[PDB]
RNA sequence: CCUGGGGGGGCCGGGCCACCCCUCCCACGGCGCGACCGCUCUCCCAGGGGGCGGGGCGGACUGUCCCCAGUGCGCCCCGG
C-alpha cells in the first residue's frame with residue numbers, strides 16, 4: 001500500500017576534527033632533529049655520571 | 050648666345066612635401082614615482098642563530114624523556 005520511501009531530514013550539525021591529521025614535512029623533520037639531538041645527551045650524562 | 054639655322058633661359062598660377070623657428074596621438078627603448086592580482090625571500094633583532102616576522106582567537110602534535118624545550122595547521126590586523 002505504501003511502497004514509496006520518504007526523504008530523510010537533511011539537517012546536519014557542525015563537524016569536528018575527530019581523526020588525527022598527517023604531520024607536515026617540517027614537523028616530521030623537527031621530530032627527527034629532536035630525536036637526534038636528545039639521544040647524545042643521554043649517553044653524555046651516563047658517561048659523566 | 051653662336052654660326053636663315055643651331056644651342057640655352059622665364060611663362061602656369063595655385064596645391065603637397067621639404068632646407069631654418071613652437072604643439073596633439075599611436076607602436077617601439079630605458080629610468081624614476083602610485084594604484085590592482087598571485088606567491089613569497091636577504092634587510093630586523095637579543096658574525097652565529099631566530100626565517101619571511103609581531104599579536105590575538107582555538108585546536109593538534111613532538112622528545113631512549115634537560116617538565117622544560119620545539120615545529121605545523123584554521124581565521125583576523127600589521128611589517129617586507
Ligand SMILES: [Mg+2]
Nearest residue numbers: 076077078079
Ligand atoms: Mg611606453
